[PDB]
């Protein structure tokens, strides 16, 4: 069942698969769980007078530093190798938002919800300009934001697109940008030429 | 560690996500005959039952793997608070690098004792991506590090393999990152100096 751990009673897995731990994205998850709280409970098993992380690291690390005194977390009776099989699941069984559904969860809030941006970002635990150029994408050709959406073009092909006045010319660039898998470089030449 | 029948959930048709890679929802689907539901999913009560919060691909790919029932935590929350804990969920996340993953394949063959073909049961991914990924740590440690914070695809990783000499691979990987080429471009390359 899902059960309140304290903090203290959990101890990180030494052998745990992931060894980069990001100090800003880490910093993110935590202001993310100052405002919604731990959505996901953490999984450990017993281990010596406590417990060991399973899977949920990152969650432990940044309730820690958003001065959390406690985790939900899920206590498996696994053996060694299935505790490992399982955080390799946690993390590898994952499909992102793109980046056109992300901006369009910001335009959903900012729209219906009548948040501003700043709040977006408290209520979400991101940088508020990480809002705001998600939102600047959705002003793009929707053929244009399909290709952001589907990775043929990065969101930084995307951001030298939006300097093209003409919506057609836009259109005509970007087709000739992804295809040839053409450099951020080389696009905001392109658009220069076309200005 | 609530079970909910898996009939009494309906997804949120607002919900964040609009695009279901199937391929991805197979893999999910394997892990979950293998592994279960590690991560409950969130709903709201709905009509005479539940409407997804966060968990549609858990949802649907534990339907795929026959499950009756999913598990589950109960929310009472309002609309937009519902759809703020839905971005929440995708968006504060951090994945392994591909290294990582390799290293974690490796674990489980050399000190687990597990076949390549176990670690592909029992994490749900494809026997050709536990192979490739193994294959990676045969790489040099620079070239390693690479693969690992992004410079190197993959793709370019596994035709750079096919480098008999490692002098010349190293040679040949930063070739590929300085003159940003193609997968493909790296395959000549790699070729030519099979021939000598
Ligand atoms: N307020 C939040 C924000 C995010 N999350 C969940 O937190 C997990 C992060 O996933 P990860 O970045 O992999 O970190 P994690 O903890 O698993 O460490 P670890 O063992 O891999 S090193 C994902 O499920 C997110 O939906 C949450 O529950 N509450
Ligand atoms: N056997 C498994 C394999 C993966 N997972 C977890 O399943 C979530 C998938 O994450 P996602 O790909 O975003 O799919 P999801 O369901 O949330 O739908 P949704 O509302 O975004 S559209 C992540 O936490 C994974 O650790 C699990 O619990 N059991
Ligand atoms: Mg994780
Ligand atoms: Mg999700």
Redesign the pocket.
């Known amino acids: 069942g899902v059960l309140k751990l304290p903090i203290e009673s959990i101890h990180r897995?030494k052998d745990?698969?992931?060894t980069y731990?990001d100090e800003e994205?880490l910093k993110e998850?935590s202001e993310?769980?100052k405002?919604?709280?731990?959505?996901?409970?953490?999984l450990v098993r017993k281990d010596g007078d406590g417990y060991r992380?399973?899977?949920?690291?990152?969650?432990?690390?940044?309730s820690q530093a958003a001065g959390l005194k406690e985790v939900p977390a899920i206590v498996r009776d696994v053996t060694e190798v299935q505790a490992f099989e399982l955080?390799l699941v946690?993390?590898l069984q994952?499909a992102d938002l793109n980046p056109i559904e992300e901006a369009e969860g910001y335009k959903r809030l900012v729209d219906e919800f009548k948040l501003t941006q700043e709040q977006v970002s408290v209520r979400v635990?991101k940088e508020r300009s990480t809002v705001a150029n998600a939102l600047r994408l959705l002003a793009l050709p929707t053929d244009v934001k399909g290709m952001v959406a589907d990775g043929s073009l990065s969101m930084g092909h995307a951001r030298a697109l939006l300097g093209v006045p003409r919506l057609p010319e836009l259109q005509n660039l970007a087709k000739q940008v992804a295809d040839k898998k053409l450099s951020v470089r080389d696009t905001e030449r392109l658009v220069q030429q076309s200005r």
């Not at 405002?35 to 953490?42: D, E, F, M």
């Open positions: 897995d745990a698969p992931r731990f994205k998850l993310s769980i405002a919604q709280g731990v959505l996901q409970p953490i992380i399973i899977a949920g690291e990152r969650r432990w690390r940044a955080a946690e993390n994952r635990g």
